[PDB]
Amino acid sequence: NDVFFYRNRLGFLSGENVIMSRSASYFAFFPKSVATLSDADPIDVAVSHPRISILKYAVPFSEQLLLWSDEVQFVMTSSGVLTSKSIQLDVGSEFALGDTARPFAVGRSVFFSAPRGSFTSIKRYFAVADVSDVKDADDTTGHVLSY
Amino acid sequence: VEYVTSSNPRDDIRVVTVADYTFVVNRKVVVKGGSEKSHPGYNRKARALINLRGGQYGRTLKVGINGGVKVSHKLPAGNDAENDPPKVDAQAIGAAMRDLLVQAYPDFTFDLGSGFLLITAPSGTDINSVETEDGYANQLISPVLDTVQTISKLPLAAPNGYIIKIQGETNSSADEYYVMYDSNTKTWKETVEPGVITGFDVTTMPHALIRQSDGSFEFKTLDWSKRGSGNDDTNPMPSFVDATINDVFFYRNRLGFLSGENVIMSRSASYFAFFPKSVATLSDADPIDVAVSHPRISILKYAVPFSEQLLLWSDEVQFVMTSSGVLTSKSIQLDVGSEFALGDTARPFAVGRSVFFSAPRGSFTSIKRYFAVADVSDVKDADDTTGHVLSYIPNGVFDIQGTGTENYICVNSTGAYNRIYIYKFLFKDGVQLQASWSHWEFPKDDKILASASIGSTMFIVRQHQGGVDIEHLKFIKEATDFPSEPYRLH
Amino acid sequence: INLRGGQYGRTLKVGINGGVKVSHKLPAGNDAENDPPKVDAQAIGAAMRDLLVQAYPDFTFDLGSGFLLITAPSGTDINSVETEDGYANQLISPVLDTVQTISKLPLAAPNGYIIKIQGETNSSADEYYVMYDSNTKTWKETVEPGV
Numbered sequence: 001n002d003v004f005f006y007r008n009r010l011g012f013l014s015g016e017n018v019i020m021s022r023s024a025s026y027f028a029f030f031p032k033s034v035a036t037l038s039d040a041d042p043i044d045v046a047v048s049h050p051r052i053s054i055l056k057y058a059v060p061f062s063e064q065l066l067l068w069s070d071e072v073q074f075v076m077t078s079s080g081v082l083t084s085k086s087i088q089l090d091v092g093s094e095f096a097l098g099d100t101a102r103p104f105a106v107g108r109s110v111f112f113s114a115p116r117g118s119f120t121s122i123k124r125y126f127a128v129a130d131v132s133d134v135k136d137a138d139d140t141t142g143h144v145l146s147y
Numbered sequence: 148v149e150y151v152t153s154s155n156p157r158d159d160i161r162v163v164t165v166a167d168y169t170f171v172v173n174r175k176v177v178v179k180g181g182s183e184k185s186h187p188g189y190n191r192k193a194r195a196l197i198n199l200r201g202g203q204y205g206r207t208l209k210v211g212i213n214g215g216v217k218v219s220h221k222l223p224a225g226n227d228a229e230n231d232p233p234k235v236d237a238q239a240i241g242a243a244m245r246d247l248l249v250q251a252y253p254d255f256t257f258d259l260g261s262g263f264l265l266i267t268a269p270s271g272t273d274i275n276s277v278e279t280e281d282g283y284a285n286q287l288i289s290p291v292l293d294t295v296q297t298i299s300k301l302p303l304a305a306p307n308g309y310i311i312k313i314q315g316e317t318n319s320s321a322d323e324y325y326v327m328y329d330s331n332t333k334t335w336k337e338t339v340e341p342g343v344i345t346g347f348d349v350t351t352m353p354h355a356l357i358r359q360s361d362g363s364f365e366f367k368t369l370d371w372s373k374r375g376s377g378n379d380d381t382n383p384m385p386s387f388v389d390a391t392i393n394d395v396f397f398y399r400n401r402l403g404f405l406s407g408e409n410v411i412m413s414r415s416a417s418y419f420a421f422f423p424k425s426v427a428t429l430s431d432a433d434p435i436d437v438a439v440s441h442p443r444i445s446i447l448k449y450a451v452p453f454s455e456q457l458l459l460w461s462d463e464v465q466f467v468m469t470s471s472g473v474l475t476s477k478s479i480q481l482d483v484g485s486e487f488a489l490g491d492t493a494r495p496f497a498v499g500r501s502v503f504f505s506a507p508r509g510s511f512t513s514i515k516r517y518f519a520v521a522d523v524s525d526v527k528d529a530d531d532t533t534g535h536v537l538s539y540i541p542n543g544v545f546d547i548q549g550t551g552t553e554n555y556i557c558v559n560s561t562g563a564y565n566r567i568y569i570y571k572f573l574f575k576d577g578v579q580l581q582a583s584w585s586h587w588e589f590p591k592d593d594k595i596l597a598s599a600s601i602g603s604t605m606f607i608v609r610q611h612q613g614g615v616d617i618e619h620l621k622f623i624k625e626a627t628d629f630p631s632e633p634y635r636l637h
Numbered sequence: 638i639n640l641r642g643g644q645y646g647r648t649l650k651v652g653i654n655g656g657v658k659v660s661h662k663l664p665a666g667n668d669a670e671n672d673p674p675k676v677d678a679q680a681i682g683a684a685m686r687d688l689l690v691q692a693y694p695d696f697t698f699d700l701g702s703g704f705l706l707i708t709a710p711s712g713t714d715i716n717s718v719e720t721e722d723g724y725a726n727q728l729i730s731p732v733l734d735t736v737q738t739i740s741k742l743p744l745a746a747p748n749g750y751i752i753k754i755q756g757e758t759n760s761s762a763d764e765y766y767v768m769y770d771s772n773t774k775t776w777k778e779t780v781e782p783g784v
Contacts, residue, residue: 033778034763048165048397049452075455079472085431086473088399090455094497096551116552117603117622128577131521133455136500138575146624200725228667232646236723261721298759303725326758331717332735335758428761 004058006065007082009043013055017046018067018076018089043084047074049091056099061110062127066092070099073135095123095137119146148366150176150354157545158492165397166418169356174391180384181346189310189341191293192273195266196309198289198302202235206282210244212255212266213276218247237262262303301335310338324377324427337375337425345374353392372420381426386436387411396450398457399474401435405447409438410459435476439466441483448491453502454519460495463488487515487529496547496556499574503556505544512540514558514570521577532570536584540568550600553622557598564594638705638720639730639743643676647723651685653696653707654717659688678703703745742776751779 002013011020022028023040031041047055053069060066067074073093079086096114103112103125110125121141128134141147150173153159161172197210204225211217220243223231233239241264245257256267268274277290291302294312301311307330315321327338339345349368358364376382387406394405401412414420415432423433439447445461452458459466465485471478488506495504495517502517513533520526533539541562548557556570566586573581589595594610605620621628627635638651645666652658661684664672674680682705686698697708709715718731732743735753742752748771756762768779 033765035765035778045400046166050163050165052164091452092455094499094551114552118624118626128521132524134521229665232665236647238648238721238723261719262725298757324759332733334735334737334755337758425761427759430761 001054001056002058006060013058016048016053016055017044018055019044039081039083041084043087045087045089047089051094057103059103059105059110061105061125062108068097068103071096093135093137097123121145150350161394163395165395165402170395171354171356172392172395174393176351177391178351178388179348180388181344181348183344183346185339185343185345186341189308191310191341192275193268194309195274195277196291196302196305197264197266197277197279198291199237199241199262199264200289200303201287202237202240203283203287204231204235206287207280208240208244208282208288209280210248210288211278212252213274214278216251217278217280218244218251220244220247260304260306263305265306304333306330310341322377322381322426324425337427339374339376340378343374343378347371353395370419372422374422375425376423377426382423385411385421385434393446393448394450396457398452403450405450408440408445408447409436410447411436431473431475433476435474435479437479437481439481449495451495451497451502453497454500458484460489462491485527485529489515493544493547496549498549498551498556503547503549505547507542510542511538512542512544512560513537514540532582533584539584546597548599550603552603557600559595559598565589565591567595567598638707638718639732640678640682640703640705641730641744642728643678643681644723644728645672645676647728648721649681649685649729650721651689651729652719653693654715655719657692658719658721659685659692661685661688701745701747704743706747745774747771751782 004011004013006020008023009020010026011018013019019029020043022031022042029042032038049072051071053072055067055069055074057068058065059068065076067076067089071094072091073095074089075092077088077090079088098113098115101113103110105111108126112123112125114121114123121139124138124140126136126138128136151160151171153173153175159173159175161174163170163172202222204222206222208220208222209217220240223234225231238259241259245259245264248257254269254272256269258265258267266274274292277292279288279290281287291300291311293310294314295301296314297316298313305328307328309328311326311328313324313326315323325338325340326335328335349371352369352371354366354368356364356366374382386409387404390406392404392406396403396405398412400415402418403413404411411421412435414423414434421434424430441464443463445464447459447461447466449460450457451460457468459468459481463486464483465487467482467484469480469482471480489504490507493505495502497503500518504515504517506513506515513531515529515531517527517529520528540558541560543561544558545561546557546559549555554572558568558570560566560568566588568584568586571581571583572579589609590611592612596608596610596615598605598607600606603622607618607620609616609618643663645663647663649661649663650658661681664675666672679700682700686700686705689698695710695713697710699706699708707715715733718733720729720731722728732741732752734751735755736742737755738757739754746769748769750769751766752769753764753766755764766779766781767776769776
């Protein structure tokens, strides 16, 4: 579904799995040897939620990486050096969106669409100031609800 | 269909869809163990082995069984030059010992192998001890029955299918494991102690529902793993053996179950294995099992992910789960977060950054909202939404639905089967701007069985006197349902 | 079949697939002009080849520099080889496709031979495959055939 770049590693998206290649080298998805385990090996994990989701877009924002689905939004992080044993994915928000237009980024905000009954709405994705690690969404077409 | 037979299908059956399966759980059946054993027909007190390794000159050897009489055999000197060297070979020594031992004990059975001598016990008799004598420091003839101290003491060869136990060094800290021998490749491999139960009773464990290509459905069971390790005390059975399961969740690439006051997770990257690979060496991909208790007494019932955390809820206490580094079986922590009370008849619903749950009272129910305070770090509060209206919703709530594009919540109940209560809200910059309570109404003698929403549509199932009907309800604007209408008829 | 060393007053026996077993007896040390030349490994290998030729007329035998090679005819699979020696398996030892540890590797082999190393029981490791080079007399990791 998509291609992205992160931590000097190429990656793909498919189903509910995140796949990353080896370090430095970009066109290799197989470990060098089985006898000895190294710290530069391909990574493969899985994520699932009861609402059922399929990953469709990858967006970098605010010194982090975000993976978006049609009902849930995930956050990727790690504890120390990023290896196959220390990668974490978790849930951050539960908004709704559509899958026909790529999100656009300007300044410190992200704009995305959200279809409705017979019209469309445009929302803005920002970060609350006083508080840390709190993402919020706001609606810009509040007054003009049928345009 | 026998796993799904009950009397109250509303508080017994649960449905969860994780991975690529649809799980069905009936929280009334009690799990039971299997009825299959380990290696069939392998007596541990019937055979013995004596190693053969080299020889010397002018030595004497003696062998005794069960503290009985001892035979004797003397090696020659080196005075001769053409007969002494051939007599020191191990095979000749073994043959001579067999010939001597045959007469002494006329009840056993002796056989010669490729560097070993085999002794067979007759019928109902158990070999308990063997004593041997040699001139050197036990480096010519040494007996072994079922146990060795280290790996280096293993015999050179043995008949196929032999089993030996390794105790290990005294100073070091380790475990006990069992090893079997192969004849074709002449190697050793880890196995399981004989006389141990391995498996679960499949027909008392969560089933699954799958869809084929033609559109039909099927109901089947699941294939769990089996034991591949030592004995009971080293590798005990999991906790959920004589209890009931309540919920199924997913976290950190590991499947999880809930039962009693215990949390159980499987191995990494494997969703159907609850047993470690080996006892000889530890690893960081082994199943986890812990326990939690509070003086107020509680039973875990629901698991809810929220705000990059996982929360476990009971009827009086709420817990928070975290870890210090890489999540292992020795680095998991559980703590106490809140003290609010709640009921156990409707699953909590999550919209935006809030969670809605019910809480019964004297004669009427109440609805609360679970959010997070902004300025403060990691504090959770609960606010009551039905504050001004306190005598509105009757008792018997059994469903909570909603939608995140129209900002409303639907609540059913058992007091009235022809009403739907609706709550409307709107948030902006962290301050609420609207809160209204009202309800709809249908004809008198009717029952509303279900009402769920997908997008901007509501599906309704109604049971009137004639039968059962299914209907739609849209939210269009400047439009008509059918093409040829003057306007939207109500 | 490995060839290494020799002694006095020892007997050797070899069998294939649980068939008949040949025998050969080493001389004693009473003489002092013919005994030493009859303990060399190469002479033992030649004698064993000569004895084995008559026993099994279908198989093919060849003598190498420190090893003896057995070739199966057409559609026949070698499944077991048994040997006998006076000492603790330090004169003649058979190997087919598997060795417990690295130190059990044969001294030499024909070019292109592949051997599988299982590993120690107590240790935690993985299974890998190794190949042999005649020109440099070394060993290198490779890939299992038929994949």
